[PDB]
C-alpha cells in the first residue's frame, strides 16, 4: 500500500546492506524487551505516586519492540535474495507503521515526564492534552509528508515544515514545564531532569533528520542510513530515556520516604 511510496522500494540490496538492515532491527527489539524486564523488576521500588511512570516505560518497550520486531518480519517477508542481490518481491514493507504507532508511543515518553516533574490534577490533564495534540499534530503531518518520499520531495518538505511547527511548540510546552517545575524536584533530580531535556531535543531531533534522507540521500545507502538513525533514536528516546526517567521516579520516591525506594537505592550504595 504504502510500500511503493517509500524509497525502499526503489532499490535492490546487497546481502550486506540487507542483513545489517535486519541486524538493527533485530538488536532494537532485544534492547527494548531486555529493558522491559529491567523496568518491571524495577517499578516495586516506585512510590505509588511515581509508579505508572515506570508502567509507561514497560508499555512503550513493548509497543516500540513490537513495532520493531514487525519492521523486521516485513522487511524479509518483503525482500528475497535473487541473482545476487535482494530483490523486492512484494509490498509488505513500509516506515508509515513507525509513524502510526507514535501516535501511542510519543503521548506515553510525555505523561510518564509529566508525572516525575510532580504534575498533578488539572495541570497534569491540561497540560497532557495540549502535549499529545501538538504530538498528534506532528505525527500526522509527518505521515502524510511521508507518502510522497518517492515522487514529491516538494510536498514532503512542507508537510515536514507544518510538522516542524507542531514539533517546535511542543518542545516549548516540555521546556517550560520542565524549567518551571525544576524546584519542586526531590533527592536532587532537579538537576537530572534538564538532562532529561537535552537528551529529548537530541534524540527527538534525530527523526526529523531521519525523514529528510530522501531528499538528500535517494539511494540504498540513505536506506541503510535511515533505519541506522532510527536505532540510535529509538534506543536514545526510548530507553536511555526511560532509564533516566525511572532513576528519577526512584530517587524522589526514596527522598519522599518510600521505604522500598530506599532500600533499593542503599543496596546499590
Ligand atoms: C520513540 C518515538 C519517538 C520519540 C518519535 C519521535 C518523533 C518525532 C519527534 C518526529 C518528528 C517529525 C518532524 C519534526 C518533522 C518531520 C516529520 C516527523 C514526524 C519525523
Ligand atoms: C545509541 C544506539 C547505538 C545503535 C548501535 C548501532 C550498531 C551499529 C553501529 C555502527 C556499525 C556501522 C557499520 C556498518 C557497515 C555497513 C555495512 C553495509 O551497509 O554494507
Ligand atoms: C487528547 C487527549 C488527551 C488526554 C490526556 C490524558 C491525561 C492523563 C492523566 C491526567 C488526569 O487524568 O488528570
Ligand atoms: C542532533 C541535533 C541536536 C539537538 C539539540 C541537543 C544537542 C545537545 C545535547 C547535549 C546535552 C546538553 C546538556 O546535558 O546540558
Ligand atoms: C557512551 C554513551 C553513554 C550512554 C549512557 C547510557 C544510559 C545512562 C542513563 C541511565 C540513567 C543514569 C542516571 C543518572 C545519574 O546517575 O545521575
Ligand atoms: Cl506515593
Ligand atoms: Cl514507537
Ligand atoms: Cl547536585
Redesign the pocket.
Known sequence: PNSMKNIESLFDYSAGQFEFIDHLLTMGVGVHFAALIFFLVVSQFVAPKYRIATALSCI?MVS?GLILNSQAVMWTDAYAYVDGSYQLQDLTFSNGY??V??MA??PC?LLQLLIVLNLKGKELFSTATWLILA?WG??I???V??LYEVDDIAQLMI??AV??A???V?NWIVGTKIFKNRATMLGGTDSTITKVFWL?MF???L??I???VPAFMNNADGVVLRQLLFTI??IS??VI?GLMITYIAIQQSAAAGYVPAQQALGRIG
Open positions: 512503550v516500540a513507525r509513524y504507532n507514535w508511543t510519543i515518553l504530538a506532528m505525527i503531518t509527518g505521515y509528508g511521508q508537510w515536514g510538522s516542524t507542531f514539533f517546535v511542543m529529548m534524540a527527538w531531533t527523526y526529523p531521519a525523514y529528510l533514536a529509538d528516546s526510548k530515556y
